[PDB]
Amino acid sequence: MIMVSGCQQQKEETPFYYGTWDEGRAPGPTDGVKSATVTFTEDEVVETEVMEGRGEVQLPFMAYKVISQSTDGSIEIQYLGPYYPLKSTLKRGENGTLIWEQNGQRKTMTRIESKTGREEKDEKSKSLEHHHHHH
Numbered sequence: 001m002i003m004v005s006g007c008q009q010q011k012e013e014t015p016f017y018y019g020t021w022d023e024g025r026a027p028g029p030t031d032g033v034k035s036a037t038v039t040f041t042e043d044e045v046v047e048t049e050v051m052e053g054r055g056e057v058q059l060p061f062m063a064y065k066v067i068s069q070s071t072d073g074s075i076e077i078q079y080l081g082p083y084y085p086l087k088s089t090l091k092r093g094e095n096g097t098l099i100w101e102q103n104g105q106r107k108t109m110t111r112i113e114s115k116t117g118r119e120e121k122d123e124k125s126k127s128l129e130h131h132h133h134h135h
Helices: none
Strands: 019-022 035-040 044-051 055-058 062-068 074-080 087-092 098-102 105-111
Touching: none
Parallel strands: none
Antiparallel strands: 019 035, 019 105, 035 044, 044 055, 044 062, 062 074, 074 087, 087 098, 098 105
């Protein structure tokens, strides 16, 4: 018998960075939210942190521009807003993850399974905050 080979290529776009990623590490102080998820939108990035008693809370969306890009390898982007001059690096990871590098820190993000062919709208919440989950 034989194993039927086949690979082809997708003409439909598949951006490896697009989606929702889990930053579900260990929590911190009052401003150290239990978990976080990052949502990548069209030209804006939306951060979400899951707060005890509040649930998922979406932060003010940050605009980004693509400086350099690959079809599937690494991506170089720069933010817009109060934190615009600091660019970030993105790379593909193992299993199906995204490697987010910022400030010299290397973060491995896992992709959550959602929007699998279903409209999922963002939420808008204005929070007066200075929360900083950090190492």
